[PDB]
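Changelog excerpt: complex records now keep ligands as SMILES alongside chain sequences, and the structure block spans every component. Example after the change:
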Amino acid sequence: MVDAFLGTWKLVDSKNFDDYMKSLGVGFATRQVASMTKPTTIIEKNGDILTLKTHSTFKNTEISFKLGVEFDETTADDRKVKSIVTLDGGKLVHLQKWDGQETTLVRELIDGKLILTLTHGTAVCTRTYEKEA
Ligand SMILES: CCCCCCCCC(=O)O
């Protein structure tokens, strides 16, 4: 179900990430640095447990979760959120909730590239990742 998402992915295109970060209240200096990083995202499974690593020269994160089971998460920008990840229409949908706010992180495979769509408020960011061999 999740298996074509698995592997190591590198950022190769980003649209509106500053808008997304600014909507979340990320400070200008953090948004500068983040606008020039190209993270590596690593998605692995072990049975029902998925681990998603995001690595860069600026911030690293790692989460582990079971699909469809809520988990606590502390995001790269230090939000303490309630999260759930599920498959919906073949897309991996990550919903974060905190302080009555939500944001979605939706991953879809198109022509072998992983497209991550980030939505918070009205801001919609699209980031494209290509698979590492
Ligand atoms: C400044 C941090 C905003 C939340 C995480 C952004 C994740 C983006 C990515 O995985 O490409």
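The chain is about 10% helix and 60% strand. The helical segments are 17-23, 28-36.
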